[PDB]
Design a protein around this ligand. Structure first.
Ligand code: FAD
Ligand code: FAD
Lengths: 356, 356
């Protein structure tokens, strides 16, 4: 049995390690990732006065994986042919390959559609880019005063076909990861309050939809009140379309003053999945599955983490959760009786609570 | 300066200790509590198969407090005369004392109106009663099968006058602490799943209102889906009125099968506060204040924790938060320049997230 695991982070690693440990020699587990190293830093930075806390974990998949009986091949998946059970990918040297699998675990995540934002290259500051959050840190300390805009781009969620899961297990969201926006808004207020710059800096938070949509209307009104108190502006239904040097523009031509734009880029499906077997993926580019992480169309394709349709919001711990489930369900198939954990939706992001 | 602190838990102790440490000799801090000891166990028990984890902290206020420069007097507050700044209370010997204060910090919490539930004495199992968690534990392990009902009683929230705080800082809730109901429902399912009794035991969850009201409809629907999957029934708008041996009845005379009734009693204002200066308290028996914890009517009365009107849901950490604020604001008044922390509403109970 050859099991291919696509990707190298939460979903992939969880599934690979859990699978190998569970079946050992009963299967060959191989991981294909677009890069040799996988980095795991902290969700949000620590904007502290004169205190820069570095804490990154760097994994070398080529060494770390074999050490666990898992093979590793670096390459960029270009498409998955679910019909012929082939994974097409480009190697670092530019060459093209395709490997057959008996089972595939898709953990290549989603996509941060920065490309959908005119002026991104020139004036954007992303919260999800590695040493891009360093560019921000430096920018924030040298900031003399002005306007700051913080928010996320729209979530191009797929809707059809639908995951084979109980009712209401998958929410409809205008934003894929919004909680971090609330936290960073509060942190930025703190940082500037400590620098006695509250009068020099003006923070505007923007949402592609209603803002923290897992909350009740009152809880959302409460959050707005907090912003009012802290002198933070809130603009709803602002689907960012462009970044200029001093402002951001929405799809309707409305603007927000912004000398510094902190953006969680729009979420779209992974291009490699958009280019895969049409009926493997939904209109968004995500793989709909059942509660066992098995594709609703191809019984030998598993989708985990961000790449799976049901993971909304797009959370690392849901990635780990789905990674395990996929691995336990598969182990059973490979003749190793294993308990398959039940999947739960999140209900609410705990970051919605300021006391967090 | 004589500062009286009423109560002996989260709000009281936080305020007393914080105040004394902040002003030292600049004031006499004395605590009056209905009992000599204050116990601090765990919010919810640990229903484990043959594994009973005890972990309770027992404080002797008479020794612990003076050790910090805080006097202690045991007695049961009967009423507060805000107009004359007198606190009336019964001593252990049965005598009725009446002391005067320059400032008072009310931390006597709320009330668990078990008395409002017919048959409580005879067949009730409370989640908020010290060793009541014990009577339950023994009952649950001897349970051969049948029906279990779990939920909370209505919250007799006060509405007038209103707290002097920003808009939407205080929610309207039908239940004062509902999160624990969700957690326990999931835990009880686990306990019985491990005993292989899922078919022998039938769990029904009941809510005085629309359950987990801080959540969006879509999050509430998700929760309902989880219940459905787990075989747990949900009955909303069920304001309990009586507990029989094998069913719970609400006001309307409606029933829910219940051989074991796990109830978080209804929340009402502390009777001592209902019998205090009429314009100190709201229609519920809670003390409305501003963001500094100062009564909106008497500038030398502070209300902290459960006894304060704004603490909804009724949370220990909000008690600790309000306790600190009260103490810092007062310290400033007593000539000790101190930073007064900003008060935030909770937004959501993190227990709403099953991954918690
Ligand atoms: C951006 C962000 C995310 C976030 C957060 C705060 C911010 C600013 N806070 C979180 C929190 O508080 N709690 C939590 O649980 N999650 C939080 N998140 C989310 C987390 O980033 C994601 O949910 C998680 O990363 C999802 O993991 P998954 O493993 O599913 O996806 P991924 O991390 O993107 O990994 C993708 C892997 O696949 C490889 N890849 C991608 N494309 C290819 C191709 N074509 N070929 C081969 N490999 C590919 C990537 O290199 C990566 O290894
Ligand atoms: C019941 C419950 C509560 C709870 C929870 C789960 C359950 C089952 N889970 C919680 C959680 O996950 N997180 C959290 O922050 N809180 C949680 N809670 C709430 C917590 O119990 C309350 O919010 C907290 O106890 C409030 O504290 P406070 O100090 O305001 O009130 P109190 O604990 O009732 O203390 C009352 C003190 O006053 C004394 N007292 C009462 N009446 C008198 C009179 N007449 N005279 C003198 N003293 C009086 C009491 O003896 C007590 O010392």
């Amino acid at each position: 049995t050859k099991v291919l695991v696509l990707g190298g982070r939460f979903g992939a690693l969880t599934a690979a390690y859990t699978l190998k440990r569970l079946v050992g020699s009963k299967a060959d587990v191989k991981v294909i990732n677009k890069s040799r190293f996988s980095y795991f830093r902290p969700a949000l930075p620590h904007v502290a006065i004169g205190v820069r806390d570095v804490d990154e974990l760097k994994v070398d998949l080529s060494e770390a994986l074999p050490e666990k009986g898992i093979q590793f091949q670096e390459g960029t998946v270009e498409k998955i042919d679910a019909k012929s059970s082939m994974v097409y990918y480009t190697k670092p040297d530019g060459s093209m390959a395709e490997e057959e699998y008996d089972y595939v675990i898709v953990g290549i995540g989603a996509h941060l559609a920065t490309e959908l934002v005119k002026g991104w290259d020139k004036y954007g500051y992303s919260v999800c880019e590695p040493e891009f959050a360093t560019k921000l840190r430096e920018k924030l300390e040298s900031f003399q005063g002005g306007n700051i805009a913080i928010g996320s781009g729209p979530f191009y969620q797929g809707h059809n076909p639908k995951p084979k899961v109980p009712e209401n297990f998958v929410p409809n969201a205008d934003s894929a990861c919004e909680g971090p926006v609330f936290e960073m808004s509060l942190m930025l207020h703190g940082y500037f309050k400590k620098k006695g710059m509250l009068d020099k800096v003006h923070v505007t938070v923007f949402s592609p939809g209603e803002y923290l949509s897992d909350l009740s209307p009152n809880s959302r009104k409460a959050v707005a009140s907090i912003y009012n108190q802290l002198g933070i502006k809130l603009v709803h239904n602002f689907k960012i379309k462009e970044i200029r040097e001093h402002e951001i523009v929405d799809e309707k031509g409305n603007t927000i003053p912004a000398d510094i734009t902190i953006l969680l880029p729009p979420y779209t499906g992974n291009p490699a999945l958009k280019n895969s077997t049409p009926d493997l993926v939904d209109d968004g580019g995500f793989i709909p599955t059942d509660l066992n992480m098995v594709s609703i169309k191809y019984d030998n394709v598993y989708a985990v983490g961000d790449a799976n349709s049901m993971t909304v919001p797009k959370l690392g711990y849901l990635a780990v959760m789905t990674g395990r489930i996929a691995a336990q369900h598969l182990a059973n198939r490979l003749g190793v009786p294993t308990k398959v954990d039940k999947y739960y939706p999140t209900i609410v992001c705990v970051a919605d609570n300021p006391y967090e």
